[PDB]
Design a protein around this ligand. Structure first.
Ligand SMILES: [Zn+2]
Ligand SMILES: [Zn+2]
Lengths: 153, 153
């Protein structure tokens, strides 16, 4: 079975983007990211708890964390469901990349439809940074843009 | 066992707003609307099919219609699930209103999480307008603002 969703990223900056998600059944979720206006380099890219955009990107809450674990890299055992790792922005400030993930379904109890995708200001340290923020946010800095994950055909 | 959702309405104009939704169980959904910058008068306010905002408010598709019926008023029998009727904008351009509805749940197959709320430019004619558009859009005109329905605490 095929389910699809999209997120339009906007924020208090010049960062804009589109993200599409698709999955079939218990399958993994394929994530296609295109974001422009980023500073060249690595950027944290996470799926956050809430699709609330009232008070800017902050209302989206923390990283989606159904298994109540600590922050990690996508390939780690111990990680938040929403830890998608880093996005690389090229010399033109554009990040295009396709990710695959197990922990962000489009159906079921752990569905991420109606939650948020956020692109961050700094590199995500994947938990291994030994900073106080390492085990919660990855020390990825402020929030550049976000969007609610909504349904598409 | 209470579910909650929110939608932040923006668009190609000067209309902005917040909408909050809540339901418990098979219960009705409560909708709290606050929209500013509207022209004084009646405005169509509908829940559309898709949370897609790629190409403005147009990507959100038509009125959410799981039962494949024609356009109607909220109290009719023959109506789209998304037909919430009209919103009244006072002399200052502000519409505050609390609606209750049966056909826009926050769980189950007919969930509206990840879909869109749209506020329209003209009065919704509730189907009884005998225009070609009367049975599909209510002839409510262009789309002033929309937002994706996302989860909150
Ligand atoms: Zn995390
Ligand atoms: Zn309708």
């Amino acid at each position: 079975a095929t389910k699809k969703a999209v997120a339009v990223l906007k924020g208090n900056s010049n960062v804009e983007g589109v993200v599409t998600l698709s999955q079939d059944d218990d399958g993994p979720t394929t994530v296609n990211v295109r974001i422009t206006g980023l500073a060249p380099g690595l950027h944290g890219f996470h799926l956050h708890e809430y699709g609330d955009t009232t008070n800017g990107c902050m209302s989206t809450g923390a990283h989606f964390n159904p298994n109540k674990l600590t922050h990690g890299a996508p390939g780690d055992e111990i990680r938040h469901a929403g830890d998608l790792g880093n996005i690389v922005a090229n010399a033109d400030g554009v990040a295009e990349v396709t990710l695959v993930d197990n922990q962000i379904p489009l159906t079921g109890p752990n569905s991420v439809v109606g939650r948020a995708l956020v692109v961050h200001e700094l590199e995500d340290d994947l938990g291994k940074g030994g900073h106080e923020l390492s085990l919660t946010t990855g020390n990825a800095g402020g929030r550049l843009a976000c969007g609610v994950v909504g349904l598409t055909p």
